[PDB]
Amino acid sequence: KKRKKKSYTTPKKNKHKRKKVKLAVLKYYKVDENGKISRLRRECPSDECGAGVFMASHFDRHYCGKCCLTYCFN
Amino acid sequence: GVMDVNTALQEVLKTALIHDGLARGIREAAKALDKRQAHLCVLASNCDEPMYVKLVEALCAEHQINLIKVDDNKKLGEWVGLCKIDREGKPRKVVGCSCVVVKDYGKESQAKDVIEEYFKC
């Protein structure tokens, strides 16, 4: 046998790259007439998730990890 | 030979470490604080982020919890045995939120008593 040579495409693919904030500021914010941390993210009504769970409010859908509910805005 | 908060903090942080605890960063702390599972958090002193410190003050105002401000943290970092990663590098210990009430399920000390006395005043 020879070397199998799995190198026809993709000269060197690597692991997925994930970049994270040093301390997340997109989760809580000011400007709600409140002196406490103001809620802009949607609160999960499910018991198995909670207020520390932040379903990422992207341009579409809600992404949870355990139930993955979807809300349409139109 | 005299007990105080400056010496009770070592014992309480060590007890938390023996039982996990020490919530590094804001993540994994929002759940507990919104469920009111914590009653003593230690924050970094001389923190250079004004938004983070004001947010932490607001979060403390939410649940009415004092946060201890102690300078010269390098002694605490040496005490917690923080070099880690065998002997390569040097991570630093700057913030920790302790879960399940003030004391974990492990040992109980008069450090808890003196910290609670400082908390009530």
UniProtKB/Swiss-Prot annotation, chain A:
Mapped onto the parent protein, the portion here is 78 to 151 of 156
Report what the protein is called: Small ribosomal subunit protein eS31
* Residue spans, zinc finger C4-type: 44-67
Report residues of the Glycyl lysine isopeptide (Lys-Gly) (interchain with G-Cter in ubiquitin) crosslink. Answer: 30, 36
Localized where? Cytoplasm; Nucleus, Nucleolus
**Disordered: where is this region?**
1-18
Organism of derivation? Homo sapiens
This chain's function reads: Component of the 40S subunit of the ribosome. Part of the small subunit (SSU) processome, first precursor of the small eukaryotic ribosomal subunit. During the assembly of the SSU processome in the nucleolus, many ribosome biogenesis factors, an RNA chaperone and ribosomal proteins associate with the nascent pre-rRNA and work in concert to generate RNA folding, modifications, rearrangements and cleavage as well as targeted degradation of pre-ribosomal RNA by the RNA exosome.
Q: Which parts of the sequence carry N6-acetyllysine?
A: 27, 36
- What gene name does this entry carry? RPS27A
How is the protein modified post-translationally, according to the record?
Monoubiquitinated at Lys-30 and Lys-36 by RNF25 in response to ribosome collisions (ribosome stalling): ubiquitination promotes subsequent activation of RNF14, leading to EEF1A1 ubiquitination and degradation and rescue of stalled ribosomes. Deubiquitination at Lys-36 by USP16 is required for maturation of the 40S ribosomal complex.
What domain of life does the UniProt record list for this protein's source? Answer: Eukaryota
Its assembly, as annotated, is: Part of the 40S ribosomal subunit. Part of the small subunit (SSU) processome, composed of more than 70 proteins and the RNA chaperone small nucleolar RNA (snoRNA) U3.
The UniProt-reported impact of residue 36 to R is: Abolished monoubiquitination by RNF25, leading to impaired ability to rescue stalled ribosomes. Abolished deubiquitination by USP16, without affecting maturation of the 40S ribosomal complex
Swiss-Prot record, chain B:
Return the protein name: Small ribosomal subunit protein eS12
Q: Name one GO cellular component term.
A: nucleolus
Encoding gene per record? RPS12
Which controlled-vocabulary keywords does the entry list? Acetylation, Cytoplasm, Nucleus, Ribonucleoprotein, Ribosomal protein
Gene Ontology biological process terms from the UniProt entry? cytoplasmic translation; maintenance of translational fidelity; positive regulation of canonical Wnt signaling pathway; ribosomal small subunit biogenesis; translation
Modified residue annotations for N6-succinyllysine:
120
Q: Which InterPro entries match?
A: Ribosomal_eL30-like_sf (IPR029064), Ribosomal_eL8/eL30/eS12/Gad45 (IPR004038), Ribosomal_eS12 (IPR000530), Ribosomal_eS12_CS (IPR047860)
> Principal place where this protein is found?
cytoplasm
Q: What does this protein do?
A: Part of the small subunit (SSU) processome, first precursor of the small eukaryotic ribosomal subunit. During the assembly of the SSU processome in the nucleolus, many ribosome biogenesis factors, an RNA chaperone and ribosomal proteins associate with the nascent pre-rRNA and work in concert to generate RNA folding, modifications, rearrangements and cleavage as well as targeted degradation of pre-ribosomal RNA by the RNA exosome. Subunit of the 40S ribosomal complex.
Q: Care to name a GO molecular-function term for this sequence?
A: structural constituent of ribosome
PANTHER family, per this entry? 40S RIBOSOMAL PROTEIN S12 (PTHR11843)
Family statement drawn from the similarity comment of this UniProt entry:
Belongs to the eukaryotic ribosomal protein eS12 family.
Signal sequence range = none
Subunit field text: Part of the small subunit (SSU) processome, composed of more than 70 proteins and the RNA chaperone small nucleolar RNA (snoRNA) U3. Subunit of the 40S ribosomal complex.
- What Gene3D superfamilies does the entry give? 3.30.1330.30
One Pfam annotation, family name? Ribosomal_L7Ae
The cross-references to PROSITE patterns, in alphabetical order and at most eight, read: RIBOSOMAL_S12E
Cellular localisation: Cytoplasm; Nucleus, Nucleolus
